[PDB]
């Protein structure tokens, strides 16, 4: 389970879609 | 954005996410 | 927060994309 | 499948993800 952010590739379980997404919210 | 399991360690672009699920049903 | 299975509208919330993914696995 | 967010109640496919969260990006 796994997520990674496109522009800077900060780890994210998938379980936790929304912490990604307030991720993109912030920019990095 | 990449999606990333932890079976195989297979990644994946975001915006492809269907390829992601077909993956997903059938065990690896 | 949520996701809809396209077969049949079955309803997951976001922060349950396991929840959805293993639904996709079993056939419906 | 859909993607559905409960501040607006927009639907989004699923293989479009990256749609829904250019969208939750910004608020509603
Ligand atoms: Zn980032
Ligand atoms: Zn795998
Ligand atoms: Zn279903
Ligand atoms: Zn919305």
């Given at each position: 389970?796994?997520?990674?952010?496109?522009?800077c590739?900060?780890?994210?379980?998938?379980?936790?879609?929304?912490?990604?997404?307030?991720?993109?919210?912030?920019?990095?």
């Amino acid at each position: 389970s796994l997520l990674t952010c496109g522009q800077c590739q900060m780890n994210f379980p998938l379980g936790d879609i929304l912490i990604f997404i307030e991720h993109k919210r912030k920019q990095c």
